[PDB]
Design an enzyme around this catalytic site. Structure first.
Site, PDB file in Angstrom:
ATOM      1  N   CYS A 103      -1.793  -5.340   5.943  1.00  0.00           N
ATOM      2  CA  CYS A 103      -1.850  -3.997   6.562  1.00  0.00           C
ATOM      3  C   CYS A 103      -3.324  -3.610   6.525  1.00  0.00           C
ATOM      4  O   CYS A 103      -4.171  -4.497   6.778  1.00  0.00           O
ATOM      5  CB  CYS A 103      -0.845  -3.063   5.876  1.00  0.00           C
ATOM      6  SG  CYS A 103      -0.848  -3.134   4.045  1.00  0.00           S
ATOM      7  N   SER A 104      -3.677  -2.400   6.124  1.00  0.00           N
ATOM      8  CA  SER A 104      -5.096  -2.107   5.886  1.00  0.00           C
ATOM      9  C   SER A 104      -5.544  -2.665   4.531  1.00  0.00           C
ATOM     10  O   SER A 104      -6.528  -3.416   4.499  1.00  0.00           O
ATOM     11  CB  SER A 104      -5.437  -0.608   6.052  1.00  0.00           C
ATOM     12  OG  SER A 104      -6.856  -0.499   6.256  1.00  0.00           O
ATOM     13  N   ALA A 105      -4.928  -2.248   3.429  1.00  0.00           N
ATOM     14  CA  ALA A 105      -5.367  -2.709   2.085  1.00  0.00           C
ATOM     15  C   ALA A 105      -4.587  -3.957   1.648  1.00  0.00           C
ATOM     16  O   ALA A 105      -5.055  -4.654   0.723  1.00  0.00           O
ATOM     17  CB  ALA A 105      -5.236  -1.582   1.081  1.00  0.00           C
ATOM     18  N   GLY A 106      -3.456  -4.247   2.280  1.00  0.00           N
ATOM     19  CA  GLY A 106      -2.610  -5.401   1.912  1.00  0.00           C
ATOM     20  C   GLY A 106      -1.820  -5.175   0.621  1.00  0.00           C
ATOM     21  O   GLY A 106      -1.569  -6.173  -0.073  1.00  0.00           O
ATOM     22  N   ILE A 107      -1.388  -3.955   0.333  1.00  0.00           N
ATOM     23  CA  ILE A 107      -0.549  -3.676  -0.872  1.00  0.00           C
ATOM     24  C   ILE A 107       0.660  -2.808  -0.541  1.00  0.00           C
ATOM     25  O   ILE A 107       1.687  -2.963  -1.228  1.00  0.00           O
ATOM     26  CB  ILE A 107      -1.413  -3.115  -2.030  1.00  0.00           C
ATOM     27  CG1 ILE A 107      -2.155  -1.824  -1.665  1.00  0.00           C
ATOM     28  CG2 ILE A 107      -2.400  -4.161  -2.481  1.00  0.00           C
ATOM     29  CD1 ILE A 107      -2.811  -1.119  -2.851  1.00  0.00           C
ATOM     30  N   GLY A 108       0.547  -1.863   0.395  1.00  0.00           N
ATOM     31  CA  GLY A 108       1.578  -0.841   0.645  1.00  0.00           C
ATOM     32  C   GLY A 108       2.685  -1.329   1.553  1.00  0.00           C
ATOM     33  O   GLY A 108       3.740  -1.755   1.068  1.00  0.00           O
ATOM     34  N   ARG A 109       2.441  -1.286   2.863  1.00  0.00           N
ATOM     35  CA  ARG A 109       3.384  -1.809   3.887  1.00  0.00           C
ATOM     36  C   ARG A 109       3.615  -3.310   3.623  1.00  0.00           C
ATOM     37  O   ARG A 109       4.783  -3.755   3.685  1.00  0.00           O
ATOM     38  CB  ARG A 109       2.841  -1.479   5.284  1.00  0.00           C
ATOM     39  CG  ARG A 109       2.554   0.004   5.485  1.00  0.00           C
ATOM     40  CD  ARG A 109       2.111   0.386   6.882  1.00  0.00           C
ATOM     41  NE  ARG A 109       0.682   0.655   6.966  1.00  0.00           N
ATOM     42  CZ  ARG A 109       0.017   0.882   8.096  1.00  0.00           C
ATOM     43  NH1 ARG A 109       0.645   0.878   9.261  1.00  0.00           N
ATOM     44  NH2 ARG A 109      -1.281   1.117   8.055  1.00  0.00           N
ATOM     45  N   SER A 110       2.555  -4.049   3.292  1.00  0.00           N
ATOM     46  CA  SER A 110       2.618  -5.487   2.961  1.00  0.00           C
ATOM     47  C   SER A 110       3.575  -5.730   1.783  1.00  0.00           C
ATOM     48  O   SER A 110       4.368  -6.709   1.818  1.00  0.00           O
ATOM     49  CB  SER A 110       1.220  -6.011   2.666  1.00  0.00           C
ATOM     50  OG  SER A 110       0.403  -6.027   3.857  1.00  0.00           O
TER      51      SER A 110
END
Ligand code: A1ABS
Length: 284
Positions: free
Chosen positions: A215-222
């Protein structure tokens, strides 16, 4: 405890913020020393989101092997994922190097290039067949082959060529285009429909390298994507599907990358997705 009953008990007591903080408190803390070296400052989109040293993906080059990406290996589940940040203008070539070296078949993108009026990731793939992209730093060429645009998401067929050896591979790009930032999909339904398309493609299967998810940071939606996939797989495999504990699955996945699931509202959606998905797994 049947997660569906746990769900209604947390909802009626409005205690999602409290469950979430409990996971934050118990989550693993491992060193991220390579991410914080001065030479790597421009390879990180966010100062507070770094890969752990033990689980970081290494680029196969002597110069600087660093990328903000983590290998999530889920033992009982038999699935691997690479979770990474949205690429930066100076890491687009590193991103495609990693896809090549790790033998990935699929890339799962859960953000739009622009969200809330700011750039959340670089335009890292070609928008027109006749305008291919060359990454001079990593010696790769990327061509758009075809594009299938739906309401919630788009699937693209890409061709990645190693200009060094002239080998080529087909990569599938799965782009969810409607997920709000620090937000949630509107219905479990479009999310799950998307997850089942990635699965149908072969991208998540053991004959390929791990799927790359961002995603943007690769922790939330990811985090939401990988958590839902793994929980549904464990419900398929086990004699007792009601033994799947989503909170325990999330803590196991947090051993490999910090901060997975970035809001109390993202965990609740995680539940709903697993619970609705079960209806399929248990024979509907
Ligand atoms: C370090 C590996 C490990 O010990 N994994 C364990 S116990 N679990 C049990 C429950 C959560 C889960 C989910 C997917 C795969 C595996 C697991």
């Amino acid at each position: 405890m049947e997660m569906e009953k746990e769900f209604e008990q947390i909802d009626k007591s409005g205690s999602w913020a409290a469950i979430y903080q409990d996971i934050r408190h118990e989550a693993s803390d491992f060193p991220s020393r390579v991410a914080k070296l001065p030479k790597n400052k421009n390879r990180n989109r966010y100062r507070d989101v770094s890969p752990f040293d033990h689980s970081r993906i290494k680029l196969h080059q002597e110069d600087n092997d660093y990328i903000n990406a983590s290998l999530i290996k889920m033992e009982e589940a038999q699935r691997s994922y690479i979770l990474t940040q949205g690429p930066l203008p100076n890491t687009v070539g590193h991103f495609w190097e990693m896809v090549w070296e790790q033998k990935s078949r699929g890339v799962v993108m859960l953000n739009r290039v622009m969200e809330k009026g700011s750039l959340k990731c670089a335009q890292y793939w070609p928008q027109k067949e006749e305008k291919e992209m060359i990454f001079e730093d990593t010696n790769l060429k990327l061509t758009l082959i075809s594009e299938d645009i739906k309401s919630y998401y788009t699937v693209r067929q890409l061709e990645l060529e190693n200009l060094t050896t002239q080998e080529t591979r087909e990569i599938l790009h799965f782009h969810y285009t409607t997920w709000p930032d620090f937000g949630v999909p509107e219905s479990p339904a479009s999310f799950l429909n998307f997850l089942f398309k990635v699965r149908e493609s072969g991208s998540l299967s053991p004959e390929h390298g791990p799927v790359v998810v961002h995603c943007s940071a690769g922790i939330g939606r990811s985090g939401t994507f990988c958590l839902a996939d793994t929980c549904l797989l464990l419900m398929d495999k086990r004699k007792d599907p009601s033994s799947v504990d989503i909170k325990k699955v999330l803590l196991e996945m947090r051993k490999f990358r910090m901060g997975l699931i970035q809001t109390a509202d993202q965990l609740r959606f995680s539940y709903l997705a697993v619970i609705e998905g079960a209806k399929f797994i248990m024979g509907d």
